[PDB]
Design a protein around this ligand. Sequence first.
Ligand code: 13L
Length: 263
Amino acid sequence: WVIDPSELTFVQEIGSGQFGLVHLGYWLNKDKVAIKTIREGAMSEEDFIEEAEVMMKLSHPKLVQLYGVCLEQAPICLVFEFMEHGCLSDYLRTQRGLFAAETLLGMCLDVCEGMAYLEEACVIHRDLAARNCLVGENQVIKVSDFGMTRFVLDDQYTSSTGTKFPVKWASPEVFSFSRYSSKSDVWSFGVLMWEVFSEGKIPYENRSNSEVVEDISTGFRLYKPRLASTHVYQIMNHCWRERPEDRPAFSRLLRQLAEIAES
Ligand SMILES: *CCC(=O)N1CCC[C@@H](n2nc(-c3cccc(C(=O)Nc4ccc(C(C)C)cc4)c3)c3c(N)ncnc32)C1
């Protein structure tokens, strides 16, 4: 799991993150990769290093793989499977008007399959959203960054009341108590479905985080996107049930969505 600095080459930048830059590069005797450099203080590096081998075993074709860690010198680097077409959020926004509902549903099915694998492995994503779903070969969507918020040291991102907390994708028990579970990931997956079927619109765009908490708590839900059928919107609403117990498991969503896609 440890990669030496001599085993990596940086070719060009891919883009920035809140905690570090991502580069396109090569990994010796392996493949082209994405390399993240992490600024000092952003991550609990020791916690991550303890968990790296464990994360690397979560190998599924619909999950963006962690290949290893270059830790010889600061800044430490994380090495990932390269996803050629980038973030799903920008992929949808820059191609509005192109995709048929069958293709948008297929994108949701790829994400659901990766999430069903994590759910079976008892691994919680914690921050599922279109921004961390990545587009690869043959337009496959893969989920990235599962469990990564466990290592973020900036309390503005991790505290349910933090200014950078992803309240718009959070179930009520997460925005209230940080009570994470695969059922809270299902709520986030419903928001992700809305981002996909809306072709990358921002959910609750004109609401503050405090307003989203009050709106959700009083029964408000995102409107149906034009491209979503009434059956797809019914499934979105099941993900947004107030009680986690009433939400479908990813194993149930995968069958329900596949039934629509395969019909
Ligand atoms: C929307 C533009 C776009 O395509 N983006 C944003 C810029 C970076 C692009 N990109 N990121 C990855 C990638 C994949 C998996 C994991 C990471 C990553 O750095 N995770 C991470 C999260 C949190 C922490 C903190 C400090 C604990 C540390 C690391 C990044 C890409 C891959 N694999 N391929 C292509 N582009 C990628 C996406």
